[PDB]
Amino acid sequence: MKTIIINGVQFNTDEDTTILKFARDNNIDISALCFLNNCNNDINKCEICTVEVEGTGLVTACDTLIEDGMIINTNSDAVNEKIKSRISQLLDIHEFKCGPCNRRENCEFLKLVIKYKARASKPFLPKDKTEYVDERSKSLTVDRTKCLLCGRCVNACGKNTETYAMKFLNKNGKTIIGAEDEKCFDDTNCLLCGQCIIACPVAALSEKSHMDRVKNALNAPEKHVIVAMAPSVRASIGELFNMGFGVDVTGKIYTALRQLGFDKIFDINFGADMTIMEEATELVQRIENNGPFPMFTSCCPGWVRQAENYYPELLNNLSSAKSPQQIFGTASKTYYPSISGLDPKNVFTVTVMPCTSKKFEADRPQMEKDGLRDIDAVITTRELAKMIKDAKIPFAKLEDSEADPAMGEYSGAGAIFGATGGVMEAALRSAKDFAENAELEDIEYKQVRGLNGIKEAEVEINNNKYNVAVINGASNLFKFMKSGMINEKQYHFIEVMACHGGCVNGGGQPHVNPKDLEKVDIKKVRASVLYNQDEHLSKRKSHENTALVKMYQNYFGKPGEGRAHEILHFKYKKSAWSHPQF
Numbered sequence: 111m112k113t114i115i116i117n118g119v120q121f122n123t124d125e126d127t128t129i130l131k132f133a134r135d136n137n138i139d140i141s142a143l144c145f146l147n148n149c150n151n152d153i154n155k156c157e158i159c160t161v162e163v164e165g166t167g168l169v170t171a172c173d174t175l176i177e178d179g180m181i182i183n184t185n186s187d188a189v190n191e192k193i194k195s196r197i198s199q200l201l202d203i204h205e206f207k208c209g210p211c212n213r214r215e216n217c218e219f220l221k222l223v224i225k226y227k228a229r230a231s232k233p234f235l236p237k238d239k240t241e242y243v244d245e246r247s248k249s250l251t252v253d254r255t256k257c258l259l260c261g262r263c264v265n266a267c268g269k270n271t272e273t274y275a276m277k278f279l280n281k282n283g284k285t286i287i288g289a290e291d292e293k294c295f296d297d298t299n300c301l302l303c304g305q306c307i308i309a310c311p312v313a314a315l316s317e318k319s320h321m322d323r324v325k326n327a328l329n330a331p332e333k334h335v336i337v338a339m340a341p342s343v344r345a346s347i348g349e350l351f352n353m354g355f356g357v358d359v360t361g362k363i364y365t366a367l368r369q370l371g372f373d374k375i376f377d378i379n380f381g382a383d384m385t386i387m388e389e390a391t392e393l394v395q396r397i398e399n400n401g402p403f404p405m406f407t408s409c410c411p412g413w414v415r416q417a418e419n420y421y422p423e424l425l426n427n428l429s430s431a432k433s434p435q436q437i438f439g440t441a442s443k444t445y446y447p448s449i450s451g452l453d454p455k456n457v458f459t460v461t462v463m464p465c466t467s468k469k470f471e472a473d474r475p476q477m478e479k480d481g482l483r484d485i486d487a488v489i490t491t492r493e494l495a496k497m498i499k500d501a502k503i504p505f506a507k508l509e510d511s512e513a514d515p516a517m518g519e520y521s522g523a524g525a526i527f528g529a530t531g532g533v534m535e536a537a538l539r540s541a542k543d544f545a546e547n548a549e550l551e552d553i554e555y556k557q558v559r560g561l562n563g564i565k566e567a568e569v570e571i572n573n574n575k576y577n578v579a580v581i582n583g584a585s586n587l588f589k590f591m592k593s594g595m596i597n598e599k600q601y602h603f604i605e606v607m608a609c610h611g612g613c614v615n616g617g618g619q620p621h622v623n624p625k626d627l628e629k630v631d632i633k634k635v636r637a638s639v640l641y642n643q644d645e646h647l648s649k650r651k652s653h654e655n656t657a658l659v660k661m662y663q664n665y666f667g668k669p670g671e672g673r674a675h676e677i678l679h680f681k682y683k684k685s686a687w688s689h690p691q692f
């Protein structure tokens with residue numbers, strides 16, 4: 111047994127762990143910065159986690175194991191001086207102007223500067239930020255005047271995607287982070303998943319803003335602005351309004367969106383039910399046609415980019431159904447005018463997404479018809495929160511309201527899209543009913559749920575056994591393919607999400623402090639809201655959505671045929687690179 115003494119207090123433990131972990135486990139305060147995802151910045155350690163081990167000297171707590179008889183002071187004058195000195199050095203390369211900053215309310219660096227009363231040896235005040243800023247991407251932005259070179263983004267990219275699209279670069283003899291060859295991220299193997307943003311302690315990495323698109327549309331007299339939120343937003347955005355984790359704020363969002371002046375309140379969960387209508391039908395068609403198997407989901411634009419960039423031979427195997435976002439958008443410019451009298455060109459469709467890659471998806475040149483974009487703007491969960499706060503809307507105090515039903519109703523199947531395994535489960539509910547011409551009672555596919563990276567199941571459909579898999583995170587797609595798992599059996603239907611946990615852990619989601627991530631399983635807690643909705647909804651199958659059924663009966667016809675097939679689908683092709691202008 112190890113006996114260790116920390117700030118005078120004796121501890122008896124068998125644990126083999128770091129000083130930082132043990133201290134955090136035992137409510138002892140130790141600061142940290144570059145340590146995240148069980149890695150610190152091995153080159154250029156930040157040393158913010160410095161503690162004193164009597165007899166040894168100053169050590170970095172985040173990668174120093176506890177040892178029997180250690181006497182540790184986390185708070186000696188020597189320790190605080192070192193840490194304060196490290197923060198001072200960072201201030202020397204940091205434009206410290208928190209007033210207008212988009213991380214002002216939850217910046218890890220600001221909190222450290224305050225805690226240690228750090229001051230720059232010389233304030234960093236660049237007169238021209240243009241050379242520090244990269245806004246070329248459809249999804250990501252970089253502001254290097256904020257960058258601490260902590261490496262958290264580089265490490266998070268590697269672990270979450272294994273693309274290493276985010277790199278340390280030598281630019282004119284000075285270190286920066288950025289994409290390969292300092293290119294626009296979009297032009298590299300990057301998935302635009304934004305996991306790098308989520309890992310950033312400061313405002314250096316952000317989403318490409320669509321807030322001006324939205325505000326200009328809202329203010330244009332002739333525009334009719336639709337807004338529709340993704341499943342995950344209602345399980346997440348309350349975090350930014352002091353409501354804590356795992357709170358369902360669906361009704362509040364609807365009210366807030368009306369107060370922001372949006373002209374129609376719909377819901378992307380309605381779009382998810384549409385995706386299932388088409389994709390479940392397509393699965394049943396492929397069963398009839400002996401393929402092409404496997405069918406892959408196509409609702410995650412991070413995964414679509416991964417396939418385009420690494421596995422172009424799989425593109426024809428993707429489901430042709432548009433994603434919940436784009437399929438909704440398509441309907442919003444066609445069906446919705448048909449039931450409203452609106453001039454289609456005056457409809458402006460806005461989504462709220464937990465995702466940065468959705469911005470790239472919405473701006474794909476061919477995601478339009480007759481000159482009308484499926485989706486005109488995509489704002490992240492974070493962007494919506496800022497919009498609500500700017501408008502002085504008292505979010506946490508709002509009464510609940512309802513969505514406009516025509517493209518706002520949703521089933522429990524659509525509701526769970528935000529969790530890894532969600533589209534798989536939702537699809538199977540409809541596909542098995544369709545194939546067996548039945549209304550089955552047993553609809554919960556718990557085998558495809560949860561945080562395991564690769565999840566498989568055998569599903570009986572119309573008295574044959576089919577093999578399905580759920581790939582949970584872009585790194586696990588690479589594992590699945592590179593390890594040859596893909597060739598161990600015939601797979602028939604495979605879900606792929608780029609973000610581990612699914613969209614509840616997307617790149618547009620609220621940041622979470624590393625200390626809170628230690629206490630809260632954010633992927634599980636956000637997803638729980640969605641599964642809870644599913645359990646409590648009367649309709650738990652996409653094809654039982656009454657507003658959806660009306661829409662097909664009155665406008666689209668039958669899924670996978672006719673008008674539905676013509677405009678609610680999208681196929682990806684391998685082709686020579688071009689600027690999107692072409």
Ligand code: SF4
Pocket residue numbers: 204205206207208211212213214215217218219220256312313314
């Ligand atoms: S990144 Fe943090 S410390 Fe820097 S200006 Fe923004 S809020 Fe202030």
Ligand code: SF4
Pocket residue numbers: 250266267268270271273274275276295299300301302303304305306307
């Ligand atoms: S968006 Fe995703 S793939 Fe691209 S650099 Fe960031 S973490 Fe890596």
Ligand code: SF4
Pocket residue numbers: 256257258259260261262263264287309310311312314315
């Ligand atoms: S962009 Fe953010 S996470 Fe990446 S090195 Fe800079 S401060 Fe760290």
Ligand code: SF4
Pocket residue numbers: 302303409410411412413464465466467468607608609612613614615616617
């Ligand atoms: S898993 Fe969801 S949030 Fe992540 S890239 Fe895919 S669609 Fe976006």
Ligand code: FES
Pocket residue numbers: 141142143144145150151155156157158159160170171172173
């Ligand atoms: S947090 Fe330990 S070296 Fe950075």
Ligand SMILES: [Cl-]
Pocket residue numbers: 514515516517
């Ligand atoms: Cl309506």
Ligand SMILES: [Cl-]
Pocket residue numbers: 340341342343464527528613614
């Ligand atoms: Cl979602």
Ligand SMILES: [Mg+2]
Pocket residue numbers: 149150151152173
């Ligand atoms: Mg290390």
Ligand SMILES: [Mg+2]
Pocket residue numbers: 327328329330331333335371
């Ligand atoms: Mg208006």
